[PDB]
C-alpha cells in the first residue's frame, strides 16, 4: 500500500517488474454523505391500539388491522421487556426501524403456551392447523407476551374459543369462522348434531392458576407486505436535504443506492415512482418531498493500471485511471480517451509504441 510500484510488485508477486502496463486495483469514488428522502407523515401508527387493546379476539377468529400511511416505531416495542417472544422471520428485529413496508397486517389473538411455537411458518398442531396458519414464505414478526394478569377471570374464562375440528387444513393467512357441524365418518350429520358429529367450536376456560404452558398468551403477528407498491409504512428517520451532482448514498422510500443524483429531463407519468434501463437497473427516482425526477448515475469507477519501465530501468511509474475524468481522481495530469494519466509528461512528438496505454496513446521512458 506504499506506492503504485509496490501495488504492481504485490499484484505480480515479484520483486522485479518487467516493462509494461499492469492493472493493480480498481479506483472507486466514495460517497461524501448519506441523504434520506422519506415521506413527511407525522401520524404515528396505531401500534398502541393493537398491542394493549381492551379485548383481543379468539384464535379461530383472529382480528386483522391494516397499518398504512403512518410513521412506524418498532424500537419502542423491542425496548419494552413485557414481550416474551419477538420472533422475526425474513426481517432482522434490530433492522425493522430502517425498513419501509408497502403494508402491515397486525393479527391479534389469545392462545396457550404449548402452541406459541405453532404460530411460525411450516409448523403443525391444533391451533396451527385449524385456527391460524402462516405461509412458508411469511415475512414478519410474531410478538407474544404472558398477560394472565388480566387474561383469566377467577373460576375459568371461557370467552376465547378455538376450532379443534375442521374439514381441511387452514390455507395460509385464511380465517374460517364457520360453525357447520362436522361429519367425522360413517354417520352422516345431515346438518344436525349427534355421536361422531363433532362440533368445530371449542372453549379455552383458562384458570388463573394453570401451568405456564396452559396459561393465556396475547399474540400480535405483524406481516410486512413488500410488493412493488409504494412504501407507506416508513420508519421515523429524519429526511435530510437533497444533494445533487455529488456521489452520495441515498434512500428514497426504502430504495437505497449509491450514485450521483442529477436533475432529470425524464417526465414520469404522475403515477410513476421509479425508472429502469434496458437491463432493469434503477435509472431515475422521484423525490418524495417535492415531485422532482432525478437521474441516478453510478459513482465513477474503473481499473487502475501502472505504466512502468522495468525495475532494471527506473522506479518511476505513471498511473492510468481507466475511463475516469481528471476531476474524480483525488506533477503532470493528462486526460486521454483511455482515462486519466498521472506522472507521465505529454510530448507532442510521435514515436513507435513502447507501452500501449489506449486510443492511439503509448508511453515510454526517455531523455
Amino acid at each position, epitope marked *: 500500500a506504499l506506492d503504485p510500484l509496490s501495488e504492481t510488485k504485490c499484484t505480480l508477486k515479484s520483486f522485479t517488474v518487467e516493462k509494461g502496463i499492469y492493472q493493480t486495483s480498481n479506483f472507486r469514488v466514495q460517497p461524501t454523505e448519506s441523504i434520506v428522502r422519506f415521506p413527511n407523515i407525522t401520524n404515528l401508527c396505531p401500534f398502541g391500539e393493537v398491542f394493549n387493546a381492551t379485548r383481543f379476539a379468539s384464535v379461530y377468529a383472529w382480528n386483522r388491522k391494516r397499518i398504512s400511511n403512518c410513521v412506524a416505531d418498532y424500537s419502542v416495542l423491542y425496548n419494552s421487556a413485557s414481550f416474551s417472544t419477538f420472533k422475526c422471520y425474513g426481517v432482522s428485529p434490530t433492522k425493522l426501524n430502517d425498513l419501509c413496508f408497502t403494508n402491515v397486517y397486525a393479527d391479534s389473538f389469545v392462545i396457550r403456551g404449548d402452541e406459541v411455537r405453532q404460530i411460525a411458518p411450516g409448523q403443525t398442531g391444533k391451533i396451527a392447523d385449524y385456527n391460524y396458519k402462516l405461509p412458508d414464505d411469511f415475512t414478519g414478526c410474531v410478538i407474544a407476551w404472558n398477560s394472565n394478569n388480566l387474561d383469566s377471570k377467577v373460576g*375459568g374464562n*371461557y370467552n376465547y374459543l378455538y376450532r*379443534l375440528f375442521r374439514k381441511s387444513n387452514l390455507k395460509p393467512f385464511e380465517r374460517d369462522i364457520s360453525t357447520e357441524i362436522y361429519q367425522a365418518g360413517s354417520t352422516p350429520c345431515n346438518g344436525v348434531e349427534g355421536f361422531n*358429529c363433532y*362440533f368445530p*367450536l*371449542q*372453549s*379455552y376456560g383458562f384458570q388463573p392458576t394453570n401451568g405456564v404452558g*396452559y396459561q393465556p398468551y396475547r399474540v400480535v403477528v405483524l406481516s410486512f407486505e413488500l410488493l412493488h407498491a409504494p412504501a407507506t409504512v416508513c420508519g421515523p428517520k429524519k429526511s435530510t436535504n437533497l444533494v445533487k451532482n455529488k456521489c452520495v448514498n441515498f434512500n428514497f422510500n426504502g430504495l437505497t443506492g449509491t450514485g450521483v443524483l442529477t436533475e432529470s429531463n425524464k417526465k414520469f407519468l404522475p403515477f410513476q415512482q421509479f425508472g429502469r434501463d434496458i437491463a432493469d437497473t434503477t435509472d431515475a427516482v422521484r423525490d418524495p418531498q417535492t415531485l422532482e425526477i432525478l437521474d441516478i448515475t453510478p459513482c465513477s469507477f474503473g481499473g487502475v493500471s501502472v505504466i512502468t519501465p522495468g525495475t532494471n530501468t527506473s522506479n518511476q511509474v505513471a498511473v492510468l485511471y481507466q475511463d475516469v475524468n481528471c476531476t474524480e481522481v483525488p506533477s503532470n495530469v493528462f486526460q486521454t480517451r483511455a482515462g486519466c494519466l498521472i506522472g507521465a509528461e505529454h510530448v507532442n512528438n510521435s514515436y513507435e509504441c513502447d507501452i500501449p496505454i489506449g486510443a492511439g496513446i503509448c508511453a515510454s521512458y526517455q531523455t
Partner: nanobody
Amino acid sequence: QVQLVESGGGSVQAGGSLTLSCVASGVTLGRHAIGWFRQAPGKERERVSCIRTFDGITSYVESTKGRFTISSNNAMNTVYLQMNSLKPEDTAVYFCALGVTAACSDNPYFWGQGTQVTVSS
C-alpha cells in the same frame, strides 16, 4: 372412540372433603357438557352436577348446592368434583357423564366406569 377414566373418592368422614377427577380420551373438553351422576342405595339415576365446557357455567341440584363444586379444565381434558360438608346420604357410586351437546340439560349418552364415595357419620 371416547374413554372417561375416573379417579378419586373412597371412604371419608361426614363433613369431610374429597376430589373426583375424570379425564376424557378420544374427545376434547371445550364444548361437550361434562358432569357427575350418582347412585345411592335403593335410589334411581339422579344428577349431582354438570359443567358446560363451552362456557364454564355450572349446574347443581338442591342436595349438592354449595357442598359440591364442579370445575372443568378443558386444557388438560379434566373435570373435578370436590365434595365438602359430606353427609351419610351422599354414600353413592359417582359416574362421569358426557354429551354430544353443549347443554347440561340434555341427558348424557357418554358414561365413565364409576367411583364409590362412602360417607361415614
